[PDB]
Structure formats: C-alpha cells, structure tokens
C-alpha cells in the first residue's frame, strides 16, 4: 500500500524479479500451466491461482488447498501477516482479472520478494549450522565455548540422524551401529589433533621463552663477570698506591 | 636446565651487597692523607733540601767548582783542577785506604 504499484517502471522491475525467481526454480517445468512462462503483463486468473498455489506451497508445504483457492487467499494472507492486507478488499478477491489487478499484481511481487528473502533467511541458517558443527592462545578466546556448542550440535545431529534410522523401515539393520562408531571416532580424533597441536605450541613456546631466557641469563652472567673484574682491578690499584708511599717513607727517616 | 642461572636475582642482589663503597672511599681518604703527610715531609724537608741543596749546592757548586766531580757510573771520582783537557781519575775501590787517598787528592789540588 506504501508502494508505487501503479508506477510502470516499478511494475516492470518487479515483474522481472518475479519471472526470474519462478523461472530459476523451475516453476514452469514443475507445473506446466505457465509452460515456458514469460512476463504476464496481462495475466489469466487460472495462471494467477497457479502461481499463488506454488509460491505458498513453497512457504508452507502441506497446506491443503480446497477446490476453490480464491476462497482461501485472504485467510492465507491473514495467517502470513501480510502487511498490506488492509489495502485489499475481500470482494475484489473473487475476480481479480479486472481493474484492481494492479493491487493484486503487486501482491504477487511481494510474495516473490518475500520468498527470495525466506529461502535466504533459512539457507543462511542451514549454512550457519554447518559452520558451527565443524567449528595464538590469548587472541583466540572462547574456543572451549565453540567446542561445547559443537558437541551440543554434534549430539543433536547424532540424535536426529540415529532417530531417522530408528523410525525408518528399510535401513535400520547394518547401517545403524556402525554409523555410531564412525561418528564417535571423528570426535576423539579431531580434538586429539587439538591436544597435540597445543603440546607443540607449548614446547616451541618453551624454545621461545628458553632462547630469550638463555640469552638473558648470559648477559646477566656478563654483567656479573666484568663488574667483579672492575672492582678487583680498582682494589689492586688502591692497595699498591697505599703500600708504595709507606716504603718511600720507610727508607727516608734515618737522619743519622 | 643448566648453562643457566639457578637464581639470577639472588646472584645480582649478592653482586650489589658485596660491592663495598665505604671501604674504597676510606682507602682514598687514606691516600689523600698519605699525600699530605709526604707533602709536609717533602716540604719542611724542601727547606731541609733547600738547605741540603743549598748546603749541597753550596758545597756542590763549591765542591764541584773545586774541580771534584763524582762519577758513580764508573765508580770513580774526577779531579779537574786546570780544565785544560787533563783530569785525574781516582777509582773508588775499597782497595786504597782513606789516608792515602786524601793525601793524594790534596797533593793533586795543590799543583
């Protein structure tokens, strides 16, 4: 309703996006009503119903459609929380191929774009989950939280798949028990990779702090040494100075 | 583990504590007072050496001006009375006696 629905440029662009999604996802092949369908700018009510049914079944698969879909469209949109629902009049829903299709056309686009984003919103989640399932010491923190999240979602994955078996019919015999052991090996393995990696980080750090430490204790040893030699040298010089005058005097005080 | 300092901080603390300042300072006050002692010994004895360099350079400019020159490099005394290119050379050997030496010298000076 807050959209330039009557603007011909807007209509054109949105038509393009509609066509692009329906064609990309094999709309016409999956349903032959709009076989090789291209830009309905003068739609047919039948086809409209086709498109709506397909898109919604993609949003909500399993929805039983009655034999007349025009009856369910308003309720479907009310359940979906269609934001523009107020701009649509129930009366105008029966036959939309007339004047106000400019509104209903817009609606269709809103669905497509919505669909575009839904398949995105969900896919990113799917992808995200995949990332969490395989998810210098100071710099990388929280890693333990990532391994505990891992094991939460790895135990989750394990549960869901093992159950898919448990309820499944054909497969449950050989593939079940082995599957467990296999999933179990990955765990101890990868974290063992961690353990050893950090043992090596530990020891090579030992050569870091040890190279530096050794060098340091060496220069310390140096200071101690030359400091000692310095004091000693001074003290020798002093001692000599004190003695010499003593002797000089020793021989000169005979006035006989 | 070794080739390393077991406790370096203790080593350096140690190194500071046995570095004895007041001892060396006291040795330098010592050396100053030594010098001052000498300076007074030299000095009161530089009037005794202005009286032994006047007693000696009066009896040395005088003895020397008598023509008697100690040559102790060669263990001998030179007598130059005439300064004509001829001198008398008297060895300081313990052999000759003191009376004969004296008599001889005064004979040479009387020529």
């Amino acid at each position: 309703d807050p959209r330039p629905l009557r603007d011909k440029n807007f209509q054109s662009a949105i038509q393009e996006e509609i066509y692009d999604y329906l064609k990309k996802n094999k709309f016409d092949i999956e349903t032959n009503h709009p076989i090789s369908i291209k830009f309905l700018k003068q739609p047919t009510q039948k086809g409209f119903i086709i498109i709506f049914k397909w898109l919604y079944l993609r949003l909500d698969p399993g929805y039983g459609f009655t034999k007349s879909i025009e009856n369910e469209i308003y309720q479907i949109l009310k359940n979906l929380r269609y934001p523009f629902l107020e701009s649509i009049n129930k009366s105008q829903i029966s036959a939309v191929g007339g004047s106000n299709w400019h509104k209903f056309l817009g609606m269709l686009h809103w669905m497509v774009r919505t669909n575009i984003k839904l398949d995105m919103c969900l896919n990113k989640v799917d992808r995200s989950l995949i990332n969490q399932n395989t998810q210098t010491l100071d710099e990388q923190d929280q890693r333990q939280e990532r391994y505990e999240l891992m094991v939460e979602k790895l135990l989750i994955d394990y549960f869901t798949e093992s159950y898919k078996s448990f309820l499944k019919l054909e497969d449950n015999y050989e593939p079940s028990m082995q599957e467990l052991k296999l999933g179990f090996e990955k765990f101890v393995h990868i974290i063992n990779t961690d353990v050893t990696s950090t043992e090596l980080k530990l020891e090579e750090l030992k050569v870091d702090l040890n190279r530096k430490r050794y060098k340091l204790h060496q220069q310390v040893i140096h200071v101690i040494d030359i400091t000692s030699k310095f004091k000693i040298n001074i003290q020798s010089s002093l001692e000599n100075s004190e003695n010499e005058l003593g002797n000089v005097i020793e021989e000169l005080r005979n006035l006989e | 583990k070794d080739n390393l300092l077991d406790n370096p901080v203790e080593f350096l603390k140690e190194v500071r504590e046995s570095f004895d300042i007041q001892q060396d300072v006291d040795a330098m006050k010592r050396i100053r007072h030594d010098l001052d002692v000498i300076k007074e010994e030299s000095e009161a004895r530089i009037s005794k050496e202005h009286s032994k360099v006047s007693e000696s350079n009066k009896k040395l400019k005088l003895y020397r001006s008598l023509g008697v020159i100690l040559d102790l490099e060669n263990d001998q005394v030179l007598i130059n009375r005439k300064n004509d290119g001829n001198i008398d050379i008297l060895p300081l050997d313990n052999n000759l006696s003191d009376f004969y030496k004296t008599k001889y010298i005064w004979e040479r000076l009387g020529k």
């Epitope: 000693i232 | 070794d2 140690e14 046995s18 570095f19």
Partner: nanobody
C-alpha cells in the same frame, strides 16, 4: 659439580705461583694441608668479590665468566709447602682432589 685444579708442583723459594680452580657441571675458595698437619682455611671469594682470609703474600681472585678462582702466592716460603684444595659452596658441598705445592728451600 666438578672442581678442576691446576698450577701446583715443585717451585723455588722467593718465586711466585698461581693456582687455578675451574668449576664445571656461589663462593669459591682455597684450603690447604701442610705435611702432617690439619686442613687450614686459606681464604674465600664470594661470587661478588667478598674476600675473607694469611698475609699479603697470598691473594685470591675470580673470573666469573670462566667459573674460575685463583690463588696467587709471591716470594714463596718453605712453610707454604702443602696440598691446596679448592672448595665451593652454595652459600662444604664440593671439594677438589688437591694440588701439591712443594717449596724447595
């Protein structure tokens, strides 16, 4: 720790001598034992140069970079004849095997 002594032997009187002791493996010092007598403390030097002694004919020093202590004797006397033992402590925990010093009258 190993204490390696060197520099002893038969020496004429009035001469000079220097004994060395190298530690391998705080204070380092010298004792001595004259023939038929008890061991006697000669003197010590701490890692820093605190010297505790014996008269001016004997002088102890150290090179810390070499971990070595030195005992210098001048104008040697017949009473100096003895077995001179190097010793080292963590403050006695370590001893050398001893180094003969014989002053020939």
């Amino acid at each position: 720790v190993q204490l390696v002594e060197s520099g002893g032997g038969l020496v004429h009187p009035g001469g000079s001598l220097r004994l060395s002791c190298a530690a391998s493996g705080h204070a380092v010092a010298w004792f001595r034992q004259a023939p038929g007598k008890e061991r006697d403390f000669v003197a010590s030097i701490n890692a820093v140069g605190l010297v505790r002694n014996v008269l001016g004919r004997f002088s102890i020093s150290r090179d810390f970079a070499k971990n070595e202590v030195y005992l210098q004797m001048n104008s040697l006397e017949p009473e100096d004849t003895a077995v001179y033992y190097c010793a080292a402590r963590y403050y006695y925990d370590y001893w050398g095997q001893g180094t003969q010093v014989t002053v020939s009258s």
